[PDB]
Design an enzyme around this catalytic site. Structure first.
Site, short mmCIF file in Angstrom:
data_model
loop_
_atom_site.label_atom_id
_atom_site.label_comp_id
_atom_site.label_asym_id
_atom_site.label_seq_id
_atom_site.Cartn_x
_atom_site.Cartn_y
_atom_site.Cartn_z
N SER A 52 0.84 -1.16 0.00
CA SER A 52 0.00 0.00 0.00
C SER A 52 0.89 1.23 0.00
O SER A 52 1.59 1.49 0.96
CB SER A 52 -0.90 -0.02 1.24
OG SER A 52 -1.77 1.07 1.19
N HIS A 59 -1.15 -1.35 -4.34
CA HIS A 59 -2.45 -0.92 -3.80
C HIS A 59 -2.44 0.60 -3.61
O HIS A 59 -1.60 1.15 -2.84
CB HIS A 59 -2.72 -1.61 -2.47
CG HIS A 59 -4.10 -1.37 -1.93
ND1 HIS A 59 -5.19 -2.07 -2.37
CD2 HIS A 59 -4.55 -0.55 -0.95
CE1 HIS A 59 -6.26 -1.69 -1.70
NE2 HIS A 59 -5.90 -0.76 -0.83
N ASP A 100 -4.66 3.66 -2.40
CA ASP A 100 -5.81 4.15 -1.66
C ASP A 100 -6.16 5.58 -2.06
O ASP A 100 -5.33 6.48 -1.90
CB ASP A 100 -5.55 4.15 -0.17
CG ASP A 100 -5.51 2.74 0.42
OD1 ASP A 100 -6.36 1.92 0.06
OD2 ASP A 100 -4.63 2.47 1.24
N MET A 134 -8.60 8.57 -1.23
CA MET A 134 -9.47 9.04 -0.15
C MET A 134 -9.81 10.50 -0.43
O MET A 134 -8.89 11.31 -0.65
CB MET A 134 -8.70 8.94 1.17
CG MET A 134 -8.18 7.54 1.51
SD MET A 134 -7.19 7.56 3.02
CE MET A 134 -6.76 5.85 3.25
N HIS A 186 -8.15 1.53 -4.86
CA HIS A 186 -9.22 1.40 -3.85
C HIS A 186 -9.82 2.76 -3.62
O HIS A 186 -9.17 3.68 -3.08
CB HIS A 186 -8.62 0.79 -2.58
CG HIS A 186 -9.56 0.67 -1.43
ND1 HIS A 186 -9.11 0.56 -0.13
CD2 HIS A 186 -10.91 0.66 -1.35
CE1 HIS A 186 -10.14 0.47 0.69
NE2 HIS A 186 -11.24 0.54 -0.03
N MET A 200 -11.99 5.08 -1.73
CA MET A 200 -12.62 5.43 -0.48
C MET A 200 -13.11 6.84 -0.70
O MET A 200 -12.58 7.82 -0.13
CB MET A 200 -11.65 5.35 0.68
CG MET A 200 -11.43 3.91 1.14
SD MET A 200 -10.06 3.74 2.31
CE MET A 200 -8.69 3.94 1.19
N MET A 229 -12.22 -4.73 5.02
CA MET A 229 -11.39 -3.82 5.80
C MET A 229 -11.22 -4.43 7.18
O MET A 229 -12.20 -4.88 7.79
CB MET A 229 -12.05 -2.43 5.94
CG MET A 229 -12.16 -1.62 4.67
SD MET A 229 -10.56 -1.30 3.93
CE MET A 229 -9.69 -0.55 5.31
N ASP A 282 -7.33 -5.53 4.25
CA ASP A 282 -6.60 -4.28 4.29
C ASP A 282 -6.78 -3.61 5.64
O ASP A 282 -7.91 -3.33 6.07
CB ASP A 282 -7.18 -3.39 3.19
CG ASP A 282 -6.55 -2.00 3.15
OD1 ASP A 282 -5.44 -1.81 3.68
OD2 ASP A 282 -7.17 -1.11 2.54
ZN LIG Z 1 -7.06 0.16 0.62
#
Ligand SMILES: [Zn+2]
Ligand SMILES: [Cl-]
Ligand SMILES: [Cl-]
Ligand SMILES: [Cl-]
Ligand SMILES: [Zn+2]
Lengths: 225, 227
Positions: B9, B34, B36, B38, B68, B70, B145, B179
């Site tokens: 990540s 990965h 993320d 956000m 991913h 979010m 998660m 994760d």
């Molecule tokens: Zn993630």
């Protein structure tokens, strides 16, 4: 008196090698590093957050970090960006609902942390809509957007310079920043209108000698004042 | 057949030197990277956006990018991340109103782009809700998660592995990712529970030898009888 301050916007650099690009700008003699924070709601894109800023601080310990919050809820980001190393935090009038008490209060919250507080306005927001927001040292700086925020490479909107002129007339000692389409050409009418702080993105990372260009910009500002 | 897939990540890397750190992970033999995303609304943090991912892609032509989302409105981010070079896109059940038809349509849209589609769930969301969604063959992966999303370095929530077990029993061939707080210790219960895809942040970037940690993790998954 007003100082000429040039701030390369890192959003215009190689986003996967920010530290290296920021160090280039620092070595080319920039005054500030302008860091645009976009949350995908206030503007349609997402740039980067506190983690990026904190990582940059680790590599550039003396640089001046100018954080521009293009986010919906600026109150939530003061502590994270203060902890990441911001030296100045600018939030938008439109993000705090044009609410004078919400704005004045947020500015003091930022200043309490020893950080300069800036207030930004979008193109469609008329300068008179601020009312007395800029009265009594509420803010350390006004940011007049010269392009619609959220995107780089746009064309400078000269008509926005009237907001700068008016602001300069009322607050002779206030730092006034412009952001959007600034280059060796547009810095002239911007300085002339009273702006002393220049955010430059695409023009600065495309420049052959960024140092010379920043020097030129300061010279232009110094000559207007 | 299920493969062990380890995905560092990047949120846990030196974000100001992403290309350099991601390259380290690629050279250490990672399976996926990965990423993320956000937006500061869906979770209380802002990480980075399509521009950053696209820049990374330019440096890492062959890496597998696992994005991913979010974010509050994943529908609006599909094309931007496809353009940035995503090989898989995971969105949250809670981002699409916990609605079965919305989740299915969004997954079909990701798949039409030749991109793998993942469905994610937060700790407070009960796995039962996702039952039919995963049976619909619209999804290539489930992401459970194991911490409250938004930040790295939090404590692994072992109670979340019940969702992994349930999912694994129902969908023996589905990639199941976990994760949050994965490391050399937590990977064991995670793999026993049935997770074959591991996102590791803090542990991976602190490892003296991330290549070996990733290999250890694949060994654990292979031994768990998950495969
Ligand atoms: Zn993630
Ligand atoms: Cl919104
Ligand atoms: Cl605060
Ligand atoms: Cl291996
Ligand atoms: Zn800005």
């Amino acid at each position: 008196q007003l100082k000429p301050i040039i701030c390369p916007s890192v959003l215009a650099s190689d986003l996967s090698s920010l530290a290296s690009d920021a160090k280039r700008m620092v070595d080319a003699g920039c005054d500030w590093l302008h860091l645009d924070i976009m949350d995908g709601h206030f503007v349609p894109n997402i740039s980067f957050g506190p983690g990026v800023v904190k990582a940059l601080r680790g590599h550039l310990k003396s640089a001046f970090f100018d954080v521009h919050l293009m986010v919906s809820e600026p109150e939530k980001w003061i502590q994270p960006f203060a902890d990441a190393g911001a030296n100045s935090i600018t939030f938008h009038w439109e993000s705090v609902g044009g609410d004078l008490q919400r704005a004045a209060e947020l500015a003091k919250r930022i200043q309490a942390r020893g950080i300069k507080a800036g207030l930004a306005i979008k193109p469609a927001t008329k300068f008179e809509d601020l009312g007395e927001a800029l009265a009594g040292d509420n803010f350390d700086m006004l940011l007049v957007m010269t392009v619609e925020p959220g995107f780089g490479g746009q064309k400078f909107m000269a008509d926005m310079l009237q907001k700068v002129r008016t602001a300069r007339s009322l607050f002779p000692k206030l730092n006034i920043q412009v952001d959007g389409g600034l280059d060796g050409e547009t810095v002239k009418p911007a300085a002339s209108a009273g702006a002393n702080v220049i955010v430059a993105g695409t023009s600065m990372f495309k420049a052959e000698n960024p140092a010379a260009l920043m020097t030129f910009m300061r010279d232009v500002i110094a000559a207007s004042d």
